[PDB]
Amino acid sequence: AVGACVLCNSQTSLRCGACIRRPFLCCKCCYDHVISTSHKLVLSVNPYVCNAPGCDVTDVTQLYLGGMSYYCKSHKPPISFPLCANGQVFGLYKVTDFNAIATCDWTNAGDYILANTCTERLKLFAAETLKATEETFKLSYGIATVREVLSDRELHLSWEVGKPRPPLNRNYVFTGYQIGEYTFEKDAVVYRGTTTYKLNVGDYFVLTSHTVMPLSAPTLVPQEHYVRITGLYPTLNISDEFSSNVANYQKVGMQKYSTLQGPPGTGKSHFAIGLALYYPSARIVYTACSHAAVDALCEKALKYLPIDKCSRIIPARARVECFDKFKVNSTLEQYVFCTVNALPETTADIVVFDEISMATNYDLSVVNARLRAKHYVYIGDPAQLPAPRTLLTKGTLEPEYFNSVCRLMKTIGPDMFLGTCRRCPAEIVDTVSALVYDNKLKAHKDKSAQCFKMFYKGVITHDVSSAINRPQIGVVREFLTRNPAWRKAVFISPYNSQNAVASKILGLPTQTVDSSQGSEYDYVIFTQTTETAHSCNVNRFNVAITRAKVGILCIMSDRDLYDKLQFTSLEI
Ligand SMILES: [Zn+2]
Ligand SMILES: [Zn+2]
Ligand SMILES: [Zn+2]
């Protein structure tokens, strides 16, 4: 019960009992907190409560120290001091932002803005408070019980009355009862068990509520600039393939941490793997939030790095199928590929943290706590999608507030920028360059003359709140009859329900914009589905159209984004 203050490090015995994380607050800060919020419970060795029998006074502003005990105004002895007086709360060893983080419900974008603009210690307090709030909210959802099993991929569910039903998508992962993790997609529903189990009638599913551990490390260690490359030994015989990144690799060794903004198809994994070739004896840990981002780094390493010096770290509680070509769980290999939540406690010469737009400050702090490194390299793009904020329903979260790294890239600029898109036809590059990259992204490919747009609002139906636009799918079906090369296209939309309908009618493989991030396909067919803040988000739009290597068809609902697409318009 004795620790350091979350606002000024000052030692104290006080903790706020009303704060979900019970942070240590010194006398001067505890006061400024209790006197400005609904939080009045103060904790020490013993709580600050009226010691008089049967009395229920817990408010610190209505309590006094009567010798060594605590009493209210009704029970205090004549010789007593108020607990709250003179800008302090009585304790041993004798904030507007702290109050807002401590009392907010995390449903407003302004809550996330504050969590990223506050001091470093408050960024950790905000990250821990937010994550704990998110887990408690998982308890609010009703239990799903198997009413009947149709097949190996379809079943019927019975829901708990009086409790809301969580959204049905890949985002919401359930735990069967422990018959493995399971996901569902929309009376017949599609079930997806991580472990193959013959679904028993009567069995039930609940959201995996994990305990939020406290944070200790900053989101970003303090920056250090060096006069020479430090702790790393470069090659002189560096492959021509990687020559373009040599100055950037030297920048990496001459600073404690560095940020790399890599727009779609500009060479982020190529840069990441090339760093291993540039500092050939360096031990590098490659991390990202998702298994897919870690696997994409493994695929690039498989091509350039010796397979015997690589290891893919997989947590024993296996959720999705991941990279099989490296030795599994060998923490001491020179190259370690592992998701943030599975990171071991280790050291490295370089830590490469990829897909940085998807990280939260909680992830940034976890990395700094598990990995002690000479250099930290953050790779991603603040113009791409952030991690979903399940609690946030009011306001839009701007890229500068995704996390500390994205905030730096949007305010002072990234340390390094990969300026040439090698994936996309010039129509796509020119569109996103103007949209989100301030005209700094250059096209390498010519215009493919296979980038088309159609303005067609159609009809919007809804599967709960997830949207469907059957007429936009009908336009795609007509287009496919006329453009058979597009038979190989991936169908993309901002909605799972739109994708489920397109899958049955078109037979094309399907991705949401969010699940398509990091992937590329020759042909993409995109149906905007609706004109909402979700389907019009410029980062989501950017990711949607930069998935294409050769052609893209965009069936648009929004006039603004339609007019911005530098594509050939199709009639109807
Ligand atoms: Zn303090
Ligand atoms: Zn509090
Ligand atoms: Zn009392």
Coordinates of all heavy atoms in Angstrom, one line a residue, residues 69-149, unseen atoms left out:
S69 N -6.9 7.6 14.4 CA -8.1 7.1 13.7 C -8.8 8.2 12.8 O -8.4 9.4 12.9 CB -9.1 6.5 14.6 OG -9.0 5.1 14.8
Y70 N -9.8 7.8 12.0 CA -10.5 8.8 11.1 C -12.0 8.8 11.5 O -12.6 7.8 11.8 CB -10.3 8.4 9.6 CG -8.9 8.0 9.3 CD1 -8.6 6.6 9.0 CD2 -7.9 8.9 9.3 CE1 -7.3 6.2 8.7 CE2 -6.6 8.5 9.1 CZ -6.3 7.1 8.8 OH -5.0 6.7 8.6
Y71 N -12.5 10.0 11.6 CA -13.9 10.2 12.0 C -14.6 11.3 11.2 O -13.9 12.2 10.7 CB -14.1 10.6 13.5 CG -13.4 9.6 14.4 CD1 -12.1 9.9 14.9 CD2 -13.9 8.4 14.8 CE1 -11.4 9.0 15.7 CE2 -13.2 7.5 15.5 CZ -11.9 7.8 16.0 OH -11.2 6.9 16.8
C72 N -15.9 11.2 11.0 CA -16.7 12.3 10.3 C -16.9 13.5 11.3 O -16.5 13.5 12.4 CB -18.0 11.7 9.8 SG -19.3 11.6 11.0
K73 N -17.6 14.6 10.8 CA -18.0 15.7 11.6 C -18.8 15.4 12.8 O -18.7 16.0 13.9 CB -18.7 16.8 10.7
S74 N -19.7 14.3 12.7 CA -20.6 13.8 13.8 C -19.9 13.0 14.9 O -20.4 12.8 15.9 CB -21.7 13.0 13.2 OG -22.7 13.7 12.5
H75 N -18.7 12.4 14.6 CA -18.0 11.5 15.5 C -16.7 11.9 15.9 O -16.1 11.3 16.8 CB -18.0 10.1 14.9 CG -19.3 9.3 14.9 ND1 -19.9 8.9 13.8 CD2 -20.1 9.0 16.0 CE1 -21.0 8.3 14.1 NE2 -21.2 8.3 15.5
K76 N -16.1 13.0 15.3 CA -14.7 13.4 15.6 C -14.5 13.9 17.0 O -15.4 14.5 17.6 CB -14.3 14.5 14.6 CG -15.0 15.8 14.8 CD -14.6 16.8 13.7 CE -14.7 18.2 14.1 NZ -13.6 18.7 14.9
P77 N -13.4 13.6 17.6 CA -13.1 14.2 18.9 C -12.8 15.7 18.8 O -12.5 16.2 17.7 CB -11.8 13.4 19.4 CG -11.1 13.1 18.2 CD -12.2 12.9 17.1
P78 N -12.8 16.5 19.9 CA -12.5 17.9 19.8 C -11.1 18.2 19.2 O -11.0 19.2 18.4 CB -12.5 18.4 21.3 CG -12.4 17.2 22.1 CD -13.1 16.1 21.3
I79 N -10.1 17.4 19.5 CA -8.8 17.6 18.9 C -8.6 16.7 17.7 O -8.2 15.5 17.8 CB -7.6 17.6 20.0 CG1 -7.7 18.8 20.9 CG2 -6.2 17.5 19.3 CD1 -6.5 19.4 21.6
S80 N -9.0 17.3 16.6 CA -9.0 16.6 15.3 C -8.7 17.6 14.1 O -9.0 18.8 14.2 CB -10.3 15.9 15.0 OG -11.3 16.8 14.8
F81 N -8.1 17.2 13.1 CA -7.7 17.9 11.9 C -8.5 17.4 10.7 O -8.5 16.2 10.6 CB -6.2 17.5 11.6 CG -5.2 18.6 11.7 CD1 -5.3 19.6 12.6 CD2 -4.1 18.5 10.8 CE1 -4.3 20.5 12.7 CE2 -3.1 19.5 10.9 CZ -3.2 20.5 11.9
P82 N -9.0 18.3 9.8 CA -9.6 17.7 8.6 C -8.7 17.0 7.7 O -7.5 17.3 7.6 CB -10.2 19.0 7.9 CG -9.5 20.1 8.4 CD -9.0 19.7 9.8
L83 N -9.1 15.9 7.1 CA -8.3 15.1 6.2 C -8.1 16.0 4.9 O -6.9 16.1 4.5 CB -9.0 13.8 5.8 CG -8.9 12.6 6.8 CD1 -9.6 11.4 6.4 CD2 -7.5 12.3 7.2
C84 N -9.1 16.7 4.5 CA -8.9 17.6 3.4 C -8.9 19.0 3.8 O -9.9 19.6 4.2 CB -10.1 17.4 2.3 SG -10.2 15.7 1.7
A85 N -7.7 19.6 3.7 CA -7.5 21.0 3.9 C -6.2 21.5 3.4 O -5.2 20.7 3.3 CB -7.6 21.3 5.4
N86 N -6.1 22.8 3.0 CA -4.9 23.4 2.5 C -4.3 22.8 1.3 O -3.1 22.6 1.2 CB -3.9 23.6 3.6 CG -3.8 25.0 4.2 OD1 -2.8 25.8 3.9 ND2 -4.7 25.4 5.0
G87 N -5.1 22.4 0.3 CA -4.7 21.8 -0.9 C -4.1 20.4 -0.8 O -3.5 19.9 -1.8
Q88 N -4.3 19.8 0.3 CA -3.8 18.4 0.6 C -4.7 17.5 1.3 O -5.6 18.0 2.1 CB -2.5 18.5 1.4 CG -1.2 19.0 0.6 CD 0.0 19.2 1.4 OE1 0.5 20.4 1.5 NE2 0.5 18.2 2.0
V89 N -4.6 16.2 1.1 CA -5.2 15.1 1.8 C -4.2 14.5 2.7 O -3.0 14.2 2.3 CB -5.8 14.0 0.8 CG1 -6.2 12.7 1.6 CG2 -6.9 14.5 0.0
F90 N -4.5 14.3 4.0 CA -3.5 13.8 5.0 C -3.1 12.4 4.7 O -3.9 11.5 4.6 CB -4.1 14.0 6.4 CG -3.1 13.4 7.5 CD1 -2.1 14.2 8.0 CD2 -3.2 12.1 7.9 CE1 -1.2 13.7 8.9 CE2 -2.3 11.6 8.8 CZ -1.3 12.4 9.3
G91 N -1.8 12.2 4.7 CA -1.2 10.9 4.5 C 0.3 10.9 4.9 O 0.7 11.8 5.7
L92 N 1.1 10.0 4.4 CA 2.5 10.0 4.7 C 3.3 10.8 3.7 O 2.7 10.9 2.6 CB 3.1 8.5 4.8 CG 2.6 7.7 6.0 CD1 2.6 6.2 5.5 CD2 3.4 7.9 7.2
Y93 N 4.5 11.3 4.0 CA 5.4 12.0 3.1 C 4.8 13.3 2.5 O 5.1 13.6 1.3 CB 5.8 11.0 1.9 CG 6.1 9.6 2.4 CD1 5.3 8.5 2.0 CD2 7.2 9.3 3.2 CE1 5.5 7.2 2.4 CE2 7.4 8.0 3.7 CZ 6.6 7.0 3.2 OH 6.9 5.7 3.7
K94 N 4.1 14.1 3.3 CA 3.4 15.3 2.9 C 4.4 16.4 2.4 O 5.6 16.3 2.5 CB 2.6 15.9 4.1
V95 N -3.4 17.9 -13.5 CA -4.4 17.1 -12.7 C -5.8 17.2 -13.3 O -6.6 16.3 -13.2 CB -4.3 17.2 -11.2 CG1 -5.1 16.1 -10.5 CG2 -2.9 17.4 -10.7
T96 N -6.1 18.4 -14.0 CA -7.4 18.5 -14.8 C -7.5 17.4 -15.8 O -8.6 16.8 -16.1 CB -7.4 19.9 -15.5 OG1 -7.5 20.9 -14.5 CG2 -8.6 20.0 -16.4
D97 N -6.3 17.0 -16.4 CA -6.3 15.9 -17.4 C -6.4 14.5 -16.7 O -7.2 13.7 -17.1 CB -4.9 16.0 -18.2 CG -4.8 17.1 -19.1 OD1 -5.8 17.8 -19.3 OD2 -3.7 17.3 -19.7
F98 N -5.8 14.3 -15.5 CA -5.9 13.1 -14.7 C -7.4 12.9 -14.3 O -7.9 11.8 -14.4 CB -5.1 13.2 -13.4 CG -5.3 12.1 -12.5 CD1 -4.8 10.8 -12.7 CD2 -6.2 12.2 -11.4 CE1 -5.1 9.8 -11.8 CE2 -6.6 11.2 -10.6 CZ -6.0 9.9 -10.8
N99 N -8.1 14.0 -13.9 CA -9.5 13.9 -13.5 C -10.4 13.4 -14.7 O -11.3 12.5 -14.5 CB -10.1 15.2 -13.0 CG -9.6 15.6 -11.7 OD1 -9.0 14.8 -10.9 ND2 -9.7 16.9 -11.4
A100 N -10.2 14.0 -15.9 CA -11.0 13.6 -17.1 C -10.7 12.1 -17.5 O -11.7 11.4 -17.7 CB -10.7 14.5 -18.2
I101 N -9.5 11.7 -17.4 CA -9.1 10.3 -17.7 C -9.8 9.3 -16.7 O -10.4 8.3 -17.0 CB -7.6 10.0 -17.8 CG1 -6.9 10.9 -18.8 CG2 -7.3 8.5 -17.9 CD1 -5.4 11.0 -18.6
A102 N -9.7 9.7 -15.4 CA -10.2 8.9 -14.3 C -11.7 8.8 -14.3 O -12.2 7.7 -13.7 CB -9.7 9.5 -13.0
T103 N -12.4 9.7 -14.8 CA -13.9 9.7 -14.7 C -14.7 9.5 -16.0 O -15.9 9.2 -16.0 CB -14.4 11.0 -14.1 OG1 -14.0 12.1 -14.9 CG2 -14.0 11.2 -12.7
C104 N -14.0 9.6 -17.2 CA -14.6 9.4 -18.5 C -15.1 7.9 -18.7 O -14.5 7.0 -18.1 CB -13.7 9.8 -19.6 SG -12.3 8.7 -20.0
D105 N -16.1 7.7 -19.6 CA -16.5 6.4 -19.9 C -16.0 5.8 -21.2 O -16.4 4.7 -21.6 CB -18.1 6.3 -19.8 CG -18.7 7.2 -20.9 OD1 -18.0 7.8 -21.8 OD2 -20.0 7.4 -20.8
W106 N -15.1 6.5 -21.9 CA -14.4 6.1 -23.1 C -15.3 5.9 -24.3 O -14.9 5.2 -25.2 CB -13.5 4.9 -22.9 CG -12.6 5.1 -21.7 CD1 -12.7 4.7 -20.4 CD2 -11.3 5.8 -21.8 NE1 -11.7 5.2 -19.7 CE2 -10.8 5.8 -20.5 CE3 -10.6 6.4 -22.8 CZ2 -9.6 6.5 -20.1 CZ3 -9.4 7.1 -22.5 CH2 -8.9 7.1 -21.2
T107 N -16.5 6.6 -24.3 CA -17.4 6.5 -25.5 C -17.2 7.7 -26.4 O -17.8 7.8 -27.5 CB -18.9 6.4 -25.0 OG1 -19.2 7.6 -24.3 CG2 -19.1 5.2 -24.1
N108 N -16.4 8.8 -26.0 CA -16.2 10.0 -26.8 C -14.8 10.0 -27.3 O -13.9 9.6 -26.6 CB -16.4 11.2 -25.9 CG -17.7 11.3 -25.1 OD1 -18.7 11.5 -25.7 ND2 -17.6 11.0 -23.8
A109 N -14.6 10.5 -28.5 CA -13.3 10.7 -29.2 C -12.4 11.6 -28.3 O -11.2 11.3 -28.3 CB -13.4 11.2 -30.6
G110 N -13.0 12.6 -27.7 CA -12.2 13.5 -26.8 C -11.5 12.9 -25.7 O -10.5 13.3 -25.2
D111 N -12.0 11.7 -25.2 CA -11.4 10.9 -24.2 C -10.0 10.3 -24.7 O -9.0 10.2 -24.0 CB -12.3 9.7 -23.8 CG -13.6 10.2 -23.2 OD1 -13.8 11.4 -22.9 OD2 -14.6 9.4 -23.1
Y112 N -10.0 9.9 -26.0 CA -8.9 9.3 -26.6 C -7.9 10.4 -27.0 O -6.7 10.2 -27.0 CB -9.3 8.5 -27.8 CG -10.2 7.3 -27.4 CD1 -11.6 7.5 -27.3 CD2 -9.7 6.0 -27.2 CE1 -12.4 6.5 -26.9 CE2 -10.5 5.0 -26.8 CZ -11.9 5.2 -26.7 OH -12.7 4.2 -26.3
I113 N -8.4 11.6 -27.4 CA -7.5 12.7 -27.7 C -6.7 13.1 -26.4 O -5.5 13.2 -26.5 CB -8.4 13.9 -28.2 CG1 -9.0 13.5 -29.6 CG2 -7.5 15.2 -28.2 CD1 -9.8 14.6 -30.2
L114 N -7.4 13.2 -25.3 CA -6.7 13.4 -24.0 C -5.7 12.4 -23.7 O -4.6 12.7 -23.3 CB -7.8 13.6 -22.9 CG -7.2 14.0 -21.6 CD1 -6.4 15.3 -21.7 CD2 -8.4 14.2 -20.6
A115 N -6.1 11.1 -23.8 CA -5.2 9.9 -23.5 C -3.9 9.9 -24.3 O -2.9 9.2 -24.0 CB -5.9 8.6 -23.7
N116 N -3.8 10.7 -25.4 CA -2.7 10.8 -26.3 C -2.0 12.1 -26.2 O -0.9 12.3 -26.7 CB -3.1 10.4 -27.7 CG -3.3 8.9 -27.7 OD1 -2.4 8.2 -27.9 ND2 -4.5 8.5 -27.5
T117 N -2.6 13.2 -25.7 CA -2.0 14.5 -25.5 C -1.5 14.8 -24.1 O -0.8 15.8 -23.9 CB -3.0 15.6 -26.0 OG1 -4.1 15.5 -25.2 CG2 -3.3 15.5 -27.5
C118 N -1.8 13.9 -23.1 CA -1.4 14.1 -21.8 C 0.1 13.7 -21.5 O 0.8 13.3 -22.5 CB -2.3 13.3 -20.9 SG -2.3 11.5 -21.2
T119 N 0.6 13.9 -20.3 CA 2.0 13.5 -20.0 C 2.1 12.0 -20.1 O 1.2 11.3 -20.2 CB 2.3 14.0 -18.6 OG1 3.7 13.5 -18.3 CG2 1.5 13.3 -17.6
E120 N 3.4 11.5 -20.2 CA 3.7 10.1 -20.4 C 3.1 9.2 -19.3 O 2.4 8.3 -19.6 CB 5.2 10.0 -20.5 CG 5.6 8.6 -21.1 CD 5.0 8.4 -22.5 OE1 5.0 9.3 -23.3 OE2 4.7 7.2 -22.7
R121 N 3.3 9.6 -18.0 CA 2.7 8.8 -16.9 C 1.1 8.7 -17.1 O 0.5 7.7 -16.8 CB 3.1 9.2 -15.5 CG 3.3 8.1 -14.6 CD 3.9 8.4 -13.2 NE 5.3 8.9 -13.4 CZ 5.7 10.1 -13.4 NH1 4.8 11.1 -13.2 NH2 7.0 10.4 -13.5
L122 N 0.5 9.8 -17.5 CA -1.0 9.8 -17.7 C -1.4 9.0 -19.0 O -2.5 8.6 -19.0 CB -1.6 11.2 -17.7 CG -1.7 11.9 -16.4 CD1 -2.3 13.3 -16.6 CD2 -2.5 11.1 -15.5
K123 N -0.5 8.9 -19.9 CA -0.8 8.0 -21.1 C -0.9 6.6 -20.6 O -1.8 5.8 -21.1 CB 0.3 8.2 -22.2 CG 0.4 9.5 -22.9 CD 1.3 9.4 -24.1 CE 1.4 10.8 -24.9 NZ 2.4 10.8 -25.9
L124 N -0.1 6.1 -19.6 CA -0.1 4.8 -19.1 C -1.3 4.6 -18.3 O -2.0 3.5 -18.3 CB 1.1 4.4 -18.3 CG 2.5 4.6 -19.0 CD1 3.6 4.1 -18.1 CD2 2.5 4.0 -20.4
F125 N -1.7 5.6 -17.4 CA -2.9 5.5 -16.6 C -4.1 5.4 -17.5 O -5.0 4.6 -17.3 CB -3.0 6.8 -15.7 CG -4.2 6.8 -14.9 CD1 -4.5 5.9 -14.0 CD2 -5.2 7.8 -15.1 CE1 -5.7 5.9 -13.2 CE2 -6.4 7.8 -14.4 CZ -6.6 6.9 -13.5
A126 N -4.1 6.3 -18.6 CA -5.2 6.2 -19.5 C -5.4 4.9 -20.2 O -6.5 4.4 -20.3 CB -5.1 7.4 -20.5
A127 N -4.2 4.3 -20.7 CA -4.2 3.1 -21.4 C -4.8 1.9 -20.5 O -5.5 1.1 -21.0 CB -2.9 2.7 -21.9
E128 N -4.3 1.9 -19.2 CA -4.7 0.8 -18.3 C -6.2 1.0 -18.0 O -7.0 0.0 -17.9 CB -3.9 1.1 -17.0 CG -3.0 0.0 -16.5 CD -2.4 0.4 -15.2 OE1 -3.1 0.2 -14.2 OE2 -1.3 1.0 -15.2
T129 N -6.7 2.2 -17.7 CA -8.1 2.5 -17.3 C -9.0 2.1 -18.5 O -10.1 1.5 -18.2 CB -8.2 4.1 -17.0 OG1 -7.3 4.4 -15.9 CG2 -9.6 4.5 -16.6
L130 N -8.7 2.6 -19.7 CA -9.4 2.3 -20.9 C -9.5 0.7 -21.1 O -10.6 0.2 -21.3 CB -8.7 2.9 -22.1 CG -9.2 2.5 -23.5 CD1 -10.7 2.8 -23.7 CD2 -8.3 3.2 -24.6
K131 N -8.4 0.0 -21.0 CA -8.4 -1.4 -21.2 C -9.3 -2.2 -20.2 O -10.0 -3.1 -20.5 CB -7.0 -2.0 -21.3 CG -7.0 -3.4 -22.0 CD -5.7 -3.8 -22.5 CE -5.7 -5.0 -23.5 NZ -4.5 -5.2 -24.3
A132 N -9.2 -1.7 -18.9 CA -10.0 -2.3 -17.9 C -11.5 -2.0 -18.1 O -12.3 -2.9 -18.0 CB -9.6 -1.7 -16.5
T133 N -11.8 -0.8 -18.6 CA -13.2 -0.4 -18.9 C -13.8 -1.3 -20.1 O -14.9 -1.8 -20.0 CB -13.3 1.1 -19.3 OG1 -12.7 1.9 -18.3 CG2 -14.8 1.5 -19.5
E134 N -12.9 -1.5 -21.1 CA -13.3 -2.4 -22.2 C -13.6 -3.8 -21.8 O -14.5 -4.4 -22.3 CB -12.1 -2.3 -23.3 CG -12.0 -1.0 -24.1 CD -10.8 -0.9 -24.9 OE1 -9.8 -1.6 -24.6 OE2 -10.7 -0.1 -25.9
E135 N -12.8 -4.4 -20.8 CA -13.0 -5.7 -20.3 C -14.3 -5.9 -19.5 O -15.1 -6.8 -19.7 CB -11.8 -6.3 -19.6 CG -10.5 -6.2 -20.4 CD -10.5 -7.1 -21.6 OE1 -11.1 -8.2 -21.6 OE2 -10.0 -6.6 -22.7
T136 N -14.6 -4.9 -18.6 CA -15.8 -4.9 -17.8 C -17.1 -4.8 -18.7 O -18.1 -5.4 -18.5 CB -15.7 -3.8 -16.8 OG1 -15.8 -2.5 -17.5 CG2 -14.5 -3.9 -15.9
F137 N -16.9 -4.0 -19.8 CA -18.0 -3.9 -20.8 C -18.4 -5.3 -21.5 O -19.5 -5.5 -21.9 CB -17.7 -2.8 -21.8 CG -18.9 -2.5 -22.6 CD1 -20.0 -1.9 -22.0 CD2 -19.1 -2.9 -23.9 CE1 -21.2 -1.7 -22.7 CE2 -20.2 -2.7 -24.6 CZ -21.3 -2.1 -24.0
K138 N -17.4 -6.2 -21.6 CA -17.6 -7.5 -22.2 C -18.6 -8.3 -21.3 O -19.3 -9.2 -21.8 CB -16.3 -8.3 -22.4 CG -15.5 -7.7 -23.6 CD -14.0 -8.1 -23.7 CE -13.9 -9.5 -24.4 NZ -12.5 -9.7 -24.8
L139 N -18.6 -8.1 -20.0 CA -19.5 -8.7 -19.1 C -21.0 -8.4 -19.3 O -21.8 -9.1 -18.9 CB -19.1 -8.4 -17.6 CG -17.6 -8.5 -17.3 CD1 -17.3 -8.1 -15.9 CD2 -17.0 -9.9 -17.6
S140 N -21.2 -7.2 -19.9 CA -22.6 -6.7 -20.1 C -23.3 -7.5 -21.2 O -24.6 -7.4 -21.2 CB -22.5 -5.2 -20.6 OG -21.6 -4.3 -20.0
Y141 N -22.6 -8.2 -22.1 CA -23.3 -9.0 -23.1 C -23.8 -10.3 -22.6 O -23.3 -11.0 -21.8 CB -22.3 -9.2 -24.3 CG -22.0 -8.0 -25.1 CD1 -20.7 -7.6 -25.3 CD2 -23.0 -7.2 -25.6 CE1 -20.4 -6.5 -26.1 CE2 -22.7 -6.1 -26.4 CZ -21.4 -5.7 -26.7 OH -21.1 -4.6 -27.4
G142 N -25.0 -10.7 -23.3 CA -25.6 -12.0 -22.9 C -24.9 -13.2 -23.5 O -24.2 -13.1 -24.5
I143 N -25.1 -14.3 -22.8 CA -24.6 -15.6 -23.1 C -25.3 -16.2 -24.3 O -26.6 -16.1 -24.4 CB -24.7 -16.6 -21.9 CG1 -23.7 -16.1 -20.8 CG2 -24.5 -18.1 -22.2 CD1 -24.0 -16.6 -19.4
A144 N -24.6 -16.8 -25.3 CA -25.2 -17.5 -26.5 C -25.2 -19.0 -26.2 O -24.1 -19.5 -25.9 CB -24.4 -17.1 -27.7
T145 N -26.3 -19.7 -26.2 CA -26.4 -21.1 -25.9 C -26.9 -21.9 -27.2 O -27.9 -21.5 -27.8 CB -27.3 -21.4 -24.7 OG1 -26.5 -21.2 -23.5 CG2 -28.0 -22.7 -24.7
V146 N -26.2 -23.0 -27.6 CA -26.6 -23.8 -28.8 C -28.0 -24.4 -28.6 O -28.2 -25.2 -27.8 CB -25.5 -24.8 -29.1 CG1 -25.9 -25.6 -30.4 CG2 -24.2 -24.2 -29.3
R147 N -28.9 -23.9 -29.5 CA -30.3 -24.4 -29.5 C -30.4 -25.7 -30.4 O -31.1 -26.6 -30.1 CB -31.2 -23.3 -29.9
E148 N -29.6 -25.7 -31.6 CA -29.5 -26.8 -32.5 C -28.3 -26.6 -33.5 O -27.9 -25.5 -33.8 CB -30.9 -27.0 -33.3 CG -31.0 -26.2 -34.7 CD -32.0 -26.8 -35.6 OE1 -31.7 -27.8 -36.3 OE2 -33.1 -26.2 -35.8
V149 N -27.7 -27.7 -34.0 CA -26.6 -27.8 -34.9 C -27.1 -28.2 -36.3 O -27.6 -29.3 -36.4 CB -25.4 -28.6 -34.4 CG1 -24.2 -28.5 -35.2 CG2 -25.2 -28.4 -32.9

